[PDB]
Structure formats: C-alpha cells, structure tokens
Amino acid sequence: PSHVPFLLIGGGTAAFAAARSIRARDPGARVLIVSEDPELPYMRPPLSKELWFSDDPNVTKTLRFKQKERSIYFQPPSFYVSAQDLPHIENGGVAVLTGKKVVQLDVRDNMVKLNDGSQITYEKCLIATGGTPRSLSAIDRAGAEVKSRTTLFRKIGDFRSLEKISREVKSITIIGGGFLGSELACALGRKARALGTEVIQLFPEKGNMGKILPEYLSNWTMEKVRREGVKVMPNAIVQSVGVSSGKLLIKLKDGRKVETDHIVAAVGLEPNVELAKTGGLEIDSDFGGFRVNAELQARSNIWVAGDAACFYDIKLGRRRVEHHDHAVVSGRLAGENMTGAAKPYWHQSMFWSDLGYEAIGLVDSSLPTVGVFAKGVIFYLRDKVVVGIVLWNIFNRMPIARKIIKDGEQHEDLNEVAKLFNIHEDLEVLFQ
Amino acid sequence: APSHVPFLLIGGGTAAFAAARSIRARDPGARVLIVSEDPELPYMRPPLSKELWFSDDPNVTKTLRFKQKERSIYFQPPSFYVSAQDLPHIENGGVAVLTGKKVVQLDVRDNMVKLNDGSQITYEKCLIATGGTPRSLSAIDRAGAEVKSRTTLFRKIGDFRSLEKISREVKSITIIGGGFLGSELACALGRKARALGTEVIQLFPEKGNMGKILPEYLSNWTMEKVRREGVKVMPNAIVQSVGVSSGKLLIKLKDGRKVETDHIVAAVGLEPNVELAKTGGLEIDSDFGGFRVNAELQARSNIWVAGDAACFYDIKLGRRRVEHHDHAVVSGRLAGENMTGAAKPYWHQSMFWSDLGGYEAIGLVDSSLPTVGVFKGVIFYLRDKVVVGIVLWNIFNRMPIARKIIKDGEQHEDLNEVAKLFNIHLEVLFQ
Numbered sequence: 001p002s003h004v005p006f007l008l009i010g011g012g013t014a015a016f017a018a019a020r021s022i023r024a025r026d027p028g029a030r031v032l033i034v035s036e037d038p039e040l041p042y043m044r045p046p047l048s049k050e051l052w053f054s055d056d057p058n059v060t061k062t063l064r065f066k067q068k069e070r071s072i073y074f075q076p077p078s079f080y081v082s083a084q085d086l087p088h089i090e091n092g093g094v095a096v097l098t099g100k101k102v103v104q105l106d107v108r109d110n111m112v113k114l115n116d117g118s119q120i121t122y123e124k125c126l127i128a129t130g131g132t133p134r135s136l137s138a139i140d141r142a143g144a145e146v147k148s149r150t151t152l153f154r155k156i157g158d159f160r161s162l163e164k165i166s167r168e169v170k171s172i173t174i175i176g177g178g179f180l181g182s183e184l185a186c187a188l189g190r191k192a193r194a195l196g197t198e199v200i201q202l203f204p205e206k207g208n209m210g211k212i213l214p215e216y217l218s219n220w221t222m223e224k225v226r227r228e229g230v231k232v233m234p235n236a237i238v239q240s241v242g243v244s245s246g247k248l249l250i251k252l253k254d255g256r257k258v259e260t261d262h263i264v265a266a267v268g269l270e271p272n273v274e275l276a277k278t279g280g281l282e283i284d285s286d287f288g289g290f291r292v293n294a295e296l297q298a299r300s301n302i303w304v305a306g307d308a309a310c311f312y313d314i315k316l317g318r319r320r321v322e323h324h325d326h327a328v329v330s331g332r333l334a335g336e337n338m339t340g341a342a343k344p345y346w347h348q349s350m351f352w353s354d355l356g357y358e359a360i361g362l363v364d365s366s367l368p369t370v371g372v373f374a375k376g377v378i379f380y381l382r383d384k385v386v387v388g389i390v391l392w393n394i395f396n397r398m399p400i401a402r403k404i405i406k407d408g409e410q411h412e413d414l415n416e417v418a419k420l421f422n423i424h425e426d427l428e429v430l431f432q
Numbered sequence: 433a434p435s436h437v438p439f440l441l442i443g444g445g446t447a448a449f450a451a452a453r454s455i456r457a458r459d460p461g462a463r464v465l466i467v468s469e470d471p472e473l474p475y476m477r478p479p480l481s482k483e484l485w486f487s488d489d490p491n492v493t494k495t496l497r498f499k500q501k502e503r504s505i506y507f508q509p510p511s512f513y514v515s516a517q518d519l520p521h522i523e524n525g526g527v528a529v530l531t532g533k534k535v536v537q538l539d540v541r542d543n544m545v546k547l548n549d550g551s552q553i554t555y556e557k558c559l560i561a562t563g564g565t566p567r568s569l570s571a572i573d574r575a576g577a578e579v580k581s582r583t584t585l586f587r588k589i590g591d592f593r594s595l596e597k598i599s600r601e602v603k604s605i606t607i608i609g610g611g612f613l614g615s616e617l618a619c620a621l622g623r624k625a626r627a628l629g630t631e632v633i634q635l636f637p638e639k640g641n642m643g644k645i646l647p648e649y650l651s652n653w654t655m656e657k658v659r660r661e662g663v664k665v666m667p668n669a670i671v672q673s674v675g676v677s678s679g680k681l682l683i684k685l686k687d688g689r690k691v692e693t694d695h696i697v698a699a700v701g702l703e704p705n706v707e708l709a710k711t712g713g714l715e716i717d718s719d720f721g722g723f724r725v726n727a728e729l730q731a732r733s734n735i736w737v738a739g740d741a742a743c744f745y746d747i748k749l750g751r752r753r754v755e756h757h758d759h760a761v762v763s764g765r766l767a768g769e770n771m772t773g774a775a776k777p778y779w780h781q782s783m784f785w786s787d788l789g790g791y792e793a794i795g796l797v798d799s800s801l802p803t804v805g806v807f808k809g810v811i812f813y814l815r816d817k818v819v820v821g822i823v824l825w826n827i828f829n830r831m832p833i834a835r836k837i838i839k840d841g842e843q844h845e846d847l848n849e850v851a852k853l854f855n856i857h858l859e860v861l862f863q
C-alpha cells in the first residue's frame with residue numbers, strides 16, 4: 001500500500017501486541033506490519049524451551065508445543081488480511097508485509113521507504129525492530145570455518161539449524177551465562193544425556209545468571225544446569241577461536257582450552273536502531289535503543305516498544321527491557337497511545353523461569369540485595385528503596401510485589417515486608 | 433484564579449510570554465493563563481545588566497525604561513492582558529497573568545496544578561517555563577548571615593534595584609564569576625565606579641573572561657576590555673572561604689591571595705527550577721540539568737517545556753540545554769505552535785550576541801571543543817571535523833550563512849574556503 005493509518009515496523013511480539021491493542025480500541029483500524037523476517041509474527045521463548053522437550057517428531061515442522069497444545073505463531077495466517085486488500089477491505093484489519101525491510105524513515109513527511117523502493121505514508125507509526133544478537137570479537141576475527149560453525153540463536157531457523165546440529169555433532173559449546181545460554185544448555189543437556197554427547201557452557205561470570213541473581217542463587221542455578229549433564233565453566237573469558245583437526249579450539253584467557261564441534265554464542269542483544277539515522281531520532285548512549293518518554297513516544301506520530309525501546313519509568317528511572325512480557329506490555333501500551341490513550345508505563349512487566357521464580361523491576365545483581373528465606377523473596381535496593389523483587393518459589397503474590405515497587409517506601413524492616421509474601425518462621429536473611 | 437483554563441503556562445518570564453503570543457497567533461480565540469511567582473508582569477532581563485545601568489534618567493529604578501529608540505523592559509503594557517477573572521468570558525479570549533502565585537504541585541494524569549495558596553487549576557495543555565535560580569557558592573553558604581546578607585544573586589528586577597543602591601553606598605564591590613552576567617555587571621559597575629571613585633573587583637577560576645565560551649585569544653581580549661573600564665580582574669581565582677573582618681568582607685582565595693571588599697555579587701551560573709518534576713513524575717536530565725524533552729519540546733502528552741529549564745534534543749547538534757534570551761523566545765514560540773498541533777522540531781537555531789564597544793554566535797559555542805579562528809574574523813567550533821558552532825567577530829548581516837553551515841553538517845576540507853563565505857580573504861588560529 002502507498003498509505004496506511006497505522007504502520008508497525010518489525011513483525012515480532014511488540015508489533016503484534018500493538019496491533020491487537022489498536023484493533024481493540026479502533027474496531028475499524030487498518031494496521032500494516034512490515035517485517036524483514038519471512039515468517040509471520042511468532043513468540044520466541046518456545047525456541048529455547050518447549051520445542052526441545054516435545055515427544056512429537058515433527059516439532060521442527062509443526063512448531064507446536066504443549067503448555068494445552070498451541071503454535072508459536074500468535075494467530076493463524078487466515079486471521080490476517082492481504083496487504084493488497086488492506087486499503088479496500090471492509091472493517092479494516094491487520095496485514096503483514098513479510099520479506100520487506102524499512103530502510104528509510106522520513107519523519108517530517110510521515111513516510112518510509114522499503115528495501116525494494118516502495119514508499120508508504122502513515123498517520124501513526126510504531127518502531128518495534130527488536131535487536132540483533134551480539135557476536136564475540138574473537139569470533140569475528142576468526143575465519144569462515146569458525147563463523148559458519150557458530151550459531152546466533154534468535155529465529156525459527158536458528159532452532160531448526162541447531163536442532164539439526166545436535167543430531168550430527170558430538171560436542172556443542174554454549175558461550176554466555178544468561179537466560180538464553182542457560183536454557184539452551186539444559187535443553188541440549190537433556191537431549192545429550194540420552195545420546196551420549198557433550199554440552200559445555202562457559203561464561204565470564206562466577207555462575208549462571210550472575211548479572212541478575214545474587215551470588216548464592218546464581219550458584220544454585222549453576223548446579224541445576226550441571227545436574228542436566230552440562231559441563232559449566234564459569235570465570236571463562238574467550239581470547240581466540242580457531243580450527244584444529246576439523247574441531248573448534250577455544251583458548252580461554254585463563255589458559256584453558258576447549259575442543260568442540262559447534263558453538264552457540266548467546267552473549268546479549270544489540271538494539272536495531274538503523275532507522276534513527278534517517279529519521280533523526282535520538283538514541284540512548286547509556287542503555288541503547290530509541291529514547292522515548294514514559295508513554296513510549298519518540299515524536300508526535302512515532303512510538304517505540306519492545307527490546308528496542310529505551311523508555312522512562314516514573315518509579316524506577318530510564319530503562320531498556322529485553323524480555324517477552326515487556327514486549328507484550330509495551331506493545332499494548334503503544335497501541336493504546338496510538339489511539340489517543342496518553343498512558344504512561346505503569347503496569348510493570350515481569351518475567352519468570354521454571355527451574356521456579358518470578359521477577360519484577362530492576363533485577364540487577366550489582367545493586368544491594370536482601371534475601372529473606374523460610375521459598376523466599378529477594379529485594380533489590382537503591383537508596384533504601386525496593387526497586388526490584390524476585391519471588392523464589394512464591395506464587396500468586398506478584399500483585400503484592402507490584403504494590404511495593406509502586407509505593408516506593410523506604411521500609412525500616414524488610415523482614416516485615418517479607419510477611420506480605422507469607423514469610424514468617426525460620427527466617428534466614430542474606431545480604432550482598 | 434480560574435478553576436479551568438485551556439492553555440496554562442507555568443512561569444511568567446520570556447519563554448512563557450513568547451509561547452502566549454505564539455498560541456494566540458495560531459488560535460485567535462485562545463485563552464492563555466500565565467501563573468508567575470514574581471509579582472511583576474513578564475519582562476526581559478538583559479537590560480538589568482546593561483542599558484538600565486547606562487541611563488541618564490535618575491528614575492530608571494522606578495520607570496524601568498531605557499534607550500537602545502526608548503522602550504520598557506516589560507514585553508507589553510499591562511492593558512494588553514485580560515483579568516484572570518475575565519479570562520474564560522472575554523470575547524476572542526486573551527492572555528491573563530496570575531502574579532504572586534507559585535505552582536507547587538503538578539498532577540499530570542489529572543491535568544491539574546495546585547498553587548501555593550491551595551488553588552487548583554485544570555488545563556488542557558500546559559507549558560513549563562520556570563527558568564532557573566542563581567547558583568550560590570559553598571563558601572558563601574558555609575559563611576554566616578553577615579556574609580549572606582552582603583551577597584547578591586543577580587537575576588530579577590529587585591536585584592537590580594538592591595545592587596544599584598549598594599553601588600551608591602559602598603566603596604568596594606566584588607563580582608565572582610567570569611561569564612556574561614559577571615562580566616557585564618563588572619563593566620556596568622565600573623562606569624558607576626569611575627564617577628563615584630569606588631572600587632570594582634572581578635575574580636573567576638578561568639584564565640580570562642568568557643573562558644568557557646570563547647577561545648583563549650578572544651577571552652583575553654574580553655578581559656582587557658573589562659580591565660579598561662576600571663575593574664580589577666583576578667583570573668585563576670578559586671574561593672576558599674568568606675568572612676567578616678572589622679565590618680569588611682574578607683575573601684580568601686585558594687591560592688593564598690586575600691581580597692577585602694564591602695559587597696559581593698555572585699554570578700556563578702544557573703540552576704534550573706525543576707521542583708515540579710517530583711510530584712509530576714517528570715524526567716530531569718542528569719547531564720545537562722532541566723526537564724528532559726524531545727525535539728518538539730514535549731515531555732508528556734499535554735506538557736511542553738521551554739526556556740532555560742528545558743533540556744531538548746537538537747536533530748542536528750544533539751541533546752542541549754540553552755540559557756539565553758533569544759532561545760527562550762525561539763523555544764517558547766515553538767512550544768506555543770506545538771501546543772496548537774504544529775508538531776514542529778527545534779530547527780531554526782537560536783542565537784546570541786554581545787556588544788563589546790560586537791559579535792554574534794550560534795550553535796555549540798563551547799571553548800572545550802576544538803576551535804579554528806580565521807581573522808574581523810569567524811571562529812569555527814568543530815566536532816568530528818563538522819562545524820557545530822560559529823562565532824562571527826565583527827561580521828554582520830551574515831548569520832543566515834552561518835545558519836546554513838550548521839544545517840549542512842559537512843565535513844569541510846578547508847575552513848579558509850568557508851571563511852570566504854563571511855568575506856574573510858589572513859590569520860588562522862587553532863585551539
């Protein structure tokens with residue numbers, strides 16, 4: 001189309017959530033999603049979890065999993081309208097222009113240019129470009145043999161290619177100790193403890209989830225990964241990567257050497273901010289991504305949501321969050337504000353990890369932490385105020401955590417706050 | 433004190449007035465309310481350190497009129513405003529000023545403010561134009577009341593009247609600060625002192641006046657023009673302590689020197705008035721200070737910020753906060769248009785000038801950047817080989833050319849060719 005009322009750049013989780021929100025408030029809305037990915041909008045968490053533990057031998061083809069069985073696609077293709085039928089169809093709809101990249105953003109003229117030369121004008125635009133997986137400098141300096149045997153896990157194709165590799169090679173090494181590195185380690189370890197193959201995980205931190213959880217909970221997570229058969233090598237920094245006798249040779253800075261067949265690099269995300277140049281949009285030098293206000297707005301007719309959005313939290317300060325529920329929350333918020341809602345980010349996004357624990361706010365191990373265990377609650381503190389909470393094996397209490405974050409009180413005794421999560425007897429308080 | 437008003441402007445200074453005139457130009461029936469904590473109607477401040485000191489009329493402290501063409505410091509006569517009680521009723525709307533009232537609470541979700549007297553006003557569109565408060569020295573704050581009562585923070589009409597009275601009563605006045613305000617008060621007090629036989633001292637940490645703005649060469653030239661007015665300029669001076677000794681103020685500098693004086697004028701920078709950010713949940717910029725706003729001067733859906741208090745995004749030059757008169761006019765006007773749906777980004781650069789017997793300036797005029805002066809002369813402020821700031825030294829009617837240079841963003845290969853655009857055809861200086 002040459003003109004569309006609502007334009008969403010990027011065909012991921014934030015864009016879809018915004019599409020459903022625009023349609024929910026403007027039942028006749030005409031929303032066009034422009035996605036460089038050839039696949040329709042889909043969720044990513046199953047690509048490192050449920051899709052690996054399915055009994056169906058056609059999961060790599062069906063892309064279905066159990067929760068209740070469902071697909072990773074947000075809705076079936078029949079629910080979308082054609083991009084050619086979007087400006088004419090009665091009652092509007094949602095169309096997805098797959099295989100097309102917005103390469104230019106003209107803010108003053110409310111216009112975008114696609115990679116094929118097409119030009120589309122909009123009335124209201126959302127940037128939901130997500131991010132690209134970061135690579136290691138050591139791997140970039142290496143040759144094609146190393147780069148071609150290194151996987152950057154993000155898309156459906158990465159799940160299929162890596163799932164295929166796990167059935168062909170004897171050893172796979174995961175670099176990175178965050179969520180993605182840990183979840184792929186457990187997934188490959190289970191598949192490896194049956195076929196007799198090897199799975200290695202190495203990262204610079206002292207333990208898995210070191211940059212998120214306190215030292216004690218980080219060590220416990222590392223032990224749960226080791227119980228799945230994974231060889232976890234903490235305190236590991238990569239110096240070089242090369243090929244030796246057809247095998248990948250990773251020489252660590254501390255001297256150790258790891259021989260493996262394939263590498264999975266899960267070492268963080270880089271926001272996709274290419275459109276900031278042509279659009280004259282500000283990017284945040286501290287957190288990265290597009291700088292937007294509390295309402296996820298960049299300019300009069302441009303919002304930003306998802307991994308790419310650096311927004312202002314009225315209670316916690318400027319942030320950029322890179323997880324699924326936040327893309328849904330911020331995507332929905334942008335869609336409402338694109339229909340005049342003028343709402344600030346207020347309902348905090350959360351995340352969880354079945355090992356299980358829930359989490360909300362500024363979960364950063366660099367902050368002072370106070371863990372209260374009986375099951376436990378970990379308070380992340382800044383200026384004597386609770387800015388982050390982790391509920392360790394405590395369920396149906398996230399609303400309580402939302403109130404604490406929202407109140408912003410300087411509590412005099414966090415053991416009393418623990419009572420709000422039913423933590424009373426045999427209290428073991430930990431500090432870090 | 434209306435309970436509801438379409439356009440609410442917080443602060444009654446230069447940015448607020450410019451926005452009111454801009455809102456009225458685009459919405460001929462607009463009803464604009466200015467809430468000002470100062471008891472005076474909107475007025476311009478530059479004359480308080482310049483023309484009002486060099487007036488032959490001995491009643492300038494009462495009339496507040498000066499020659500440039502004679503004019504008042506007030507932006508318009510009081511009759512052009514409408515009463516706050518008649519604002520929601522007057523035909524074709526108008527602009528009302530609620531003087532003597534401070535907005536002490538901002539409720540963004542409810543589009544409501546609370547004044548210091550308990551009054552509550554709801555708005556449809558709001559502009560924050562609170563300006564800033566003069567910074568003080570820690571040495572003066574650590575001192576006692578005897579010192580604090582003999583220290584002047586120059587900004588408002590009352591400060592001009594109070595200091596003008598002091599200049600006629602005391603024998604020695606010390607100015608702390610080498611910026612515009614400190615330098616202009618030095619020349620103004622120096623002329624008054626060369627007639628009464630009094631003393632004027634100016635001390636600052638920089639190597640010369642305007643050290644943080646102009647390159648070393650133009651800074652030293654400015655220091656010589658101030659010294660020629662009778663002022664004792666003491667550069668490289670940092671204040672360690674201030675006390676009273678035999679009824680006289682004793683300023684001990686960190687390097688050992690001691691200055692005895694009767695009164696102090698502290699012009700050591702400005703602190704943006706961002707008190708309303710707490711209750712309003714508004715972001716402030718930790719790097720530049722002030723309210724953080726985007727290229728359109730917008731903070732939230734119905735809230736803009738202009739003037740000295742606004743930290744905005746320049747599409748060409750990056751994030752900035754500018755503290756001068758023309759910028760309050762430019763950003764105030766821009767906010768007024770965007771409050772009437774313009775959606776325009778800051779694009780037309782604000783400028784400033786200084787008559788030194790003069791020069792014009794535009795962009796990032798910061799001496800910490802590399803400079804290339806071509807001398808009449810033009811000084812280019814460079815960043816990544818791109819011209820981000822220009823100072824036209826005794827070159828007039830060429831600011832449009834300077835505006836285009838800033839707008840182009842070229843990485844010029846020879847600034848001597850760009851100098852020809854200002855009719856400079858040769859002493860090239862570097863810093």
Ligand SMILES: Cc1cc2nc3c(=O)[nH]c(=O)nc-3n(C[C@H](O)[C@H](O)[C@H](O)COP(=O)(O)OP(=O)(O)OC[C@H]3O[C@@H](n4cnc5c(N)ncnc54)[C@H](O)[C@@H]3O)c2cc1C
Pocket residue numbers: 009010011012013014015034035036037043044045046047048100101102103128129130131153154155180272275305306307308322323324325327350351352
């Ligand atoms: C394997 C995996 C597992 C995860 N598991 C979890 C989990 O368990 N829990 C959790 O909370 N989070 C998880 N996450 C994170 C979560 O998936 C992300 O937060 C979420 O996908 C971000 O949504 P998004 O819309 O911001 O971006 P994306 O999903 O990356 O979508 C952006 C889309 O826009 C496209 N695009 C970019 N630039 C352009 C352009 N110029 N023109 C057109 N299209 C463009 C990109 O190609 C991409 O297709 C996981 C992520 C991965 C990769």
Ligand SMILES: Cc1cc2nc3c(=O)[nH]c(=O)nc-3n(C[C@H](O)[C@H](O)[C@H](O)COP(=O)(O)OP(=O)(O)OC[C@H]3O[C@@H](n4cnc5c(N)ncnc54)[C@H](O)[C@@H]3O)c2cc1C
Pocket residue numbers: 442443444445446447448467468469470476477478479480481533534535536561562563564586587588613705708738739740741755756757758760784785
């Ligand atoms: C003595 C002097 C000389 C100057 N000379 C020059 C010059 O020659 N050239 C130049 O370019 N610039 C000059 N400047 C700078 C220029 O005057 C300022 O940049 C300009 O005043 C900024 O306008 P403003 O509206 O942003 O703020 P202000 O003029 O400070 O106006 C803000 C007003 O809002 C009021 N206010 C604050 N908070 C509240 C509240 N909560 N409720 C109600 N009211 C509130 C403040 O009291 C103040 O009255 C000079 C400044 C001074 C002080």
Ligand SMILES: Nc1ccnc2ccc(Cl)cc12
Pocket residue numbers: 048179180181183322323324351352353
């Ligand atoms: N379980 C997760 C919670 C929060 N953020 C994540 C980011 C990436 C991956 Cl793979 C998993 C998570």
Ligand SMILES: Nc1ccnc2ccc(Cl)cc12
Pocket residue numbers: 478481612613614616755756757784785786
């Ligand atoms: N000439 C000036 C230019 C820019 N900013 C100023 C601030 C205060 C004073 Cl007194 C003068 C100026």
